[PDB]
């Protein structure tokens, strides 16, 4: 069946004196965004962001919009509480984030579930892998943890992660089976760039690949490098595929000694390129 994930990334940011916090939730299947909710609209609604979601009927959008609106109120409260727990100066913008969702392996049994939270960009509380206990990041989040233990909330999240989360991931993969599920293998090449009288930069490119995960490295004679290698962050092309490059500075006349290596799910055998 090969692995997949459903994930939501949710952010609220306070703007004191200038209105209610701005709240945005975005949903992904694997590396593909498919839904959003943004509180900055006259009439905010949960909305499709992938073609294959557009034929979900109105009851889907209604239910999801109700859940997102409840979350919006939860985030407003949490921003206020966290500020009190951490004894911060009033005024000032703060952020609360949540990331949650499910991964499946080669069956419809949940491989891993997530329910993690962050305040001001740093861990606050997260549900452990057992889906039974909580890791509190500090003594402020310990207050929250005791509240959530007494409520039995781990059971609530466990039920979602094992049930409805995986059910709907399954449905999304069917709706977008065409585009999700594909593997676009990287097209690779090396470019050559004079640097000085003594050396040159060789740059090894991987273009148009999906999914985003890839390994791209240079070697000097079968061994990984004893020198600096520039490796840029994997980056979106905009059209649903990804790009990456790795550059080495090498002495003139020794260009043939260096090999670029590309590993990706969509490649029968790893690629080896040489200038």
């Amino acid at each position: 069946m090969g692995p997949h994930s459903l994930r939501y990334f949710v952010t609220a940011v306070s703007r004191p004196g200038l209105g209610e916090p701005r709240f945005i939730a975005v949903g992904y299947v694997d590396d593909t965004q498919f839904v959003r909710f943004d509180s900055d609209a006259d009439n905010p609604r949960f909305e499709p962001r992938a073609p294959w979601m557009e034929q979900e009927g109105p009851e889907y959008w209604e239910e999801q919009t109700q859940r997102a609106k409840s979350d919006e109120q939860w985030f407003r409260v949490s921003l206020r509480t966290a500020q009190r727990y951490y004894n911060q100066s009033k005024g000032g913008s703060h952020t609360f984030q949540r990331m949650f969702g499910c991964d499946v392996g080669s069956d419809w049994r949940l491989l891993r579930g997530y329910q993690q939270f962050a305040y001001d960009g740093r861990d606050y509380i997260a549900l452990n892998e057992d889906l039974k206990t909580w890791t509190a990041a500090d003594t402020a989040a310990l207050i929250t943890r005791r509240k959530w233990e007494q409520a039995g909330d781990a059971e609530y999240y466990r039920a979602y992660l094992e049930g409805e989360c995986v059910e709907w991931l399954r449905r999304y993969l069917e709706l977008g089976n065409e585009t999700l599920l594909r593997t676009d293998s990287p097209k690779a090449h090396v470019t050559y760039h004079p640097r000085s009288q003594v050396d040159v930069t060789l740059r090894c490119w991987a273009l148009g690949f999906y999914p985003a995960d890839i390994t791209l490295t240079w070697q000097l004679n079968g061994e990984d490098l004893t020198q600096d290698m520039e490796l840029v962050e994997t980056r979106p092309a905009g059209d649903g595929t990804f790009q990456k490059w790795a550059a080495v500075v090498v002495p003139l006349g020794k260009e043939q000694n260096y090999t670029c290596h590309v590993h990706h799910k969509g490649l029968p055998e790893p690629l080896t390129l040489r200038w």
């Binding site: 990334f9 952010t11 940011v13 945005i24 975005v26 992904y28 965004q33 959003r36 943004d38 962001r49 913008s93 703060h94 952020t95 984030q97 990331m99 962050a118 001001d120 960009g121 740093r122 861990d123 470019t191 760039h193 740059r203 273009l207 840029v232 962050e233 980056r235 979106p236 092309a237 905009g238 059209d239 790009q243 490059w245």
Partner: protein, 100 residues
């Protein structure tokens, strides 16, 4: 709250060819807090029709966003992405380089 300075890449969707229509991307990542100002420029002038992705964040909580616009590389035109962010004591401009 620890501020994280945005990491910026400016690059084309397709390998650039002079005179051929393309898309210029400005991918800004690994920043905090989420308020950010991104603009793209051609020859030092703001480009007016710039689309932005919905902002999201990575596993490590840091925010990212993709800005892009239509463009046509030529031998003499130049392109840049200018980013303002609270982590930075002034705006950061990154010029498009067809080798990167």
């Amino acid at each position: 709250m620890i501020q994280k300075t945005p990491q910026i890449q400016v690059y084309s969707r397709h390998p650039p060819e002079n005179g051929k229509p393309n898309i210029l991307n400005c991918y800004v990542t690994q920043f905090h807090p989420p308020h950010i100002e991104i603009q793209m420029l051609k020859n030092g002038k703001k480009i007016p029709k710039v689309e932005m992705s919905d902002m999201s964040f990575s596993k490590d909580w840091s925010f990212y966003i993709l800005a892009h616009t239509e463009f046509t590389p030529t031998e003499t035109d130049t392109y840049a992405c200018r980013v303002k962010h609270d982590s930075m004591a002034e705006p950061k401009t990154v010029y498009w380089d067809r080798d990167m």
